Structure 1
Amino acid sequence: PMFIVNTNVPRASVPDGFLSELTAALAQATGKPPQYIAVHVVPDQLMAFGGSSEPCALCSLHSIGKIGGAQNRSYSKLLCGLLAERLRISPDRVYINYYDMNAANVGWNNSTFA
């Protein structure tokens, strides 16, 4: 699984430990080992949400399976909760796009997961 967060929050506001906390949380949530979790945080972005430049985030989670109605609700609660507690971003200023990737469309270690 891969989680990317783009945000206008400044780099200095990202706490130590944030990638590691995301990694462990996403391993637990998705049922995949932490060795398979990739995370990427991109602060200091030029963005607006609802025409306002208050803190906000535009995120993605890609996974081969483990994506669906109830699972994505659970991910959203988890991930909004973390963005709120660690980056002080209001949950209603977060969008997360979920992608259920076909194994044949995910490259790794010179091949694909198919």
Structure 2
Amino acid sequence: PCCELITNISIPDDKAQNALSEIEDAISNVLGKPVAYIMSNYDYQKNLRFSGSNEGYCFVRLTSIGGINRSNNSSLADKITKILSNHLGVKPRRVYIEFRDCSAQNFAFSGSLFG
């Protein structure tokens, strides 16, 4: 899976990676996938807006080959938002998460398709 965090909250690199490590653990747990398959990123975007304001906010795009369904989506939405709130101080009502399914024929690793 790939987890893209985009946020206007600035924290030091060690803290950023801490938050990602916890998000990686949640993804691994919920999707039943090893850490070996998980990409994550903390993208600091100073001009990011939500509801017409530059107040602290997070957007997460989570892309996975399978595992995108109501049960997993709900569980991860809860867990990821909690992590972001705790680690970044963001209000839960300023956290958006998008879930994307990708087919194995449309994803490559080490120069070859998964499918």
Specify the alignment match of 1:38 in structure 2.
39
C-alpha contact 1:11 1:44 (8 A) present in aligned 2: no
Q: What's the TM-score, normalizing by structure 2?
A: 0.91
Q: Deviation at 1:45?
A: 2.7
Distance 1:99 1:26 in 2: 14
**Residues 35-87 of structure 1: CA deviation (Å, up to 9, x unaligned):** 11110111243111000111101110000110011211111001101110000
Superposed CA RMSD: 1.6
Q: Deviation at 1:18?
A: 2.1
Distance 2:59 2:82 in 1: 14
Specify the alignment match of 2:99 in structure 1.
98
**Does the alignment pair 1:64 with 2:65?**
yes
Give unpaired runs (5+ residues) of structure 1: none
> Aligned pair in 2 of structure 1 residues 28, 99: CA closer, same or farther (>3 Å)?
same
Specify the alignment match of 1:86 in structure 2.
87
Distance 1:77 1:13 in 2: 24
Distance 2:109 2:73 in 1: 24
Give unpaired runs (5+ residues) of structure 2: none
Q: How many residues align?
A: 114
C-alpha contact 2:19 2:83 (8 A) present in aligned 1: no
Q: Percent identity among equivalent residues?
A: 31
Distance 1:19 1:69 in 2: 23
Specify the alignment match of 2:10 in structure 1.
10
Residues 9-28 of structure 1 mapped to structure 2, 5 A cutoff: 9-12=9-12, 15=15, 17-28=18-29
Q: What letter corresponds to residue 9 of structure 2 in structure 1?
A: V
